[PDB]
Symmetry: D2
Subunit: 60 residues, 4 copies
């Protein structure tokens, strides 16, 4: 009786901890992806500007 | 007796499924990050080349 | 009489050659700028795509 | 006599002005190329950094 309860408690703690670990890692990679989003946006804007200027120079 | 076992089985199935879901999502975001790695590498190489040529033109 | 004509011919040849040189250099730098145009265009398209995918991954 | 001198003066003024024009345009395109140099340098540095961080996230 007691041993069954104990074993089950340890199984629950195992899955719980593995789940918290995956949660944390997923938060980390999600943050990194957000950073990549911002950076990509900035770079796109900057290259589009540089292209505009480049074309003003090519036209004139 | 029986109801306790059943309830515990449902708890285990819950944590199990949530864990599999986090596993899958984490695999997805990891793959995306790998893609970003490759792409960043390529872009770095290409810009360094374009710079080299740009500097040959500026020197000559 | 003769020396004046000769001197003037050499002046004309000087300005002519300097002008041809500037013409050639300007063609070179213009070609390089065109290359930069194409490259910038490609890079803009590629980064916009990578952003689209990144956002599909962030949304799902 | 006089007309020959005048005509030659106009030829010299023509080549002179065309030469000054090519000089100015070449300065413009050279400045633009310098801007492109700086920008390319910055972008290379930034992408290399973003790659470093991306790889720290992938390693941990
Ligand atoms: Cl729990
Ligand atoms: Cl795990
Ligand atoms: Cl929790
Ligand atoms: Cl299990
Ligand atoms: Cl979840
Ligand atoms: Cl499994
Ligand atoms: Cl001529
Ligand atoms: Cl010159
Ligand atoms: Cl000619
Ligand atoms: Cl002169
Ligand atoms: Cl011209
Ligand atoms: Cl002058």
């Amino acid at each position: 009786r007691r041993v069954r309860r104990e074993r089950n408690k340890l199984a629950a703690a195992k899955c719980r901890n593995r789940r918290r670990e995956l949660t944390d890692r997923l938060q980390a990679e999600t943050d990194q992806l957000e950073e990549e989003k911002a950076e990509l946006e900035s770079e796109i804007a900057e290259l589009q500007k540089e292209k505009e200027r480049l074309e003003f120079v090519l036209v004139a």
